[PDB]
Design a protein around this ligand. Structure first.
Ligand SMILES: CN(CCO)c1ccc(-c2nc3cc(Cl)ccc3c(=O)[nH]2)cc1
Ligand SMILES: [Zn+2]
Lengths: 160, 47
């Protein structure tokens, strides 16, 4: 039940999403090993993901969390990169989208830095890079990220 | 998937070495995220 609505680059909504993508690029400690060497992106398309069932699933859980946390969902907009982006937009997030070996346990990971999520587009550590050229720093192949609405509720603070 | 820490709904990873990194987050229920936007892009080679 998912449809994708293309946003015009003239739309304020496109513009604010692009700005969050671009402005949250940083340098990474791997020198670009996982995600490639870059300071900015060429945005090709931004599509709104519309699925009523998946939205109602989200809002139902959001209300449960809010009611457990003094009417505060602690909702954020965060990036997610994954080889299964096209599965997620149709079927939703579930345990198959978890990073079993992640540093904060087996769960589904999100980033404030778009460039952190970019490290996971082709798999953990960038995998073997793009399918066509086997290049984690490919400048040719199209990549996709999700910009997601995430309910944090009461969040456990783990220091680095 | 694992469970959230008791009394919590997510984990926040706060960097303590890289002063420029932003936070990372983990949820343990897929129902706690909705994929609002699909962004198609290329990384750009620096000049
Ligand atoms: C479905 N999988 C395992 C793929 O075999 C997966 C693993 C990691 C990620 C992922 N991990 C992150 C970790 C941090 Cl610290 C920050 C952001 C991400 C992210 O966007 N995706 C996404 C999917
Ligand atoms: Zn490629």
């Amino acid at each position: 039940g998912t449809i994708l609505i293309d946003l015009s680059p003239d739309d304020k909504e496109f513009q604010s999403v692009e700005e969050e993508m671009q402005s949250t690029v940083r340098e990474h400690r791997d020198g670009g090993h996982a995600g490639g060497i870059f300071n900015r992106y060429n945005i090709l398309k931004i599509q709104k993901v519309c699925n009523k069932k998946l939205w109602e699933r989200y809002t139902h859980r959001r209300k449960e969390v809010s009611e457990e946390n003094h009417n505060h969902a602690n909702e954020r907009m965060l990036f997610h990169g994954s080889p299964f982006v096209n599965a997620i937009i149709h079927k939703g997030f579930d345990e198959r989208h978890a990073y079993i070996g992640g540093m904060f346990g087996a769960g589904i990971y999100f980033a404030e830095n778009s460039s952190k999520s970019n490290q996971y587009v082709y798999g953990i550590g960038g995998g073997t890079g793009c399918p066509v050229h086997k290049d984690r720093s490919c400048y040719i192949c199209h990549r996709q990220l999700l910009f997601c609405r995430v309910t944090l509720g009461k969040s456990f603070l783990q220091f680095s | 998937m694992a469970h959230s820490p008791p009394g919590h709904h997510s984990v926040t990873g706060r960097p303590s070495v890289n002063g420029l990194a932003l936070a990372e987050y983990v949820i343990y229920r897929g129902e706690q995220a909705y994929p609002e936007y699909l962004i198609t892009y290329q990384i750009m080679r620096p000049e």
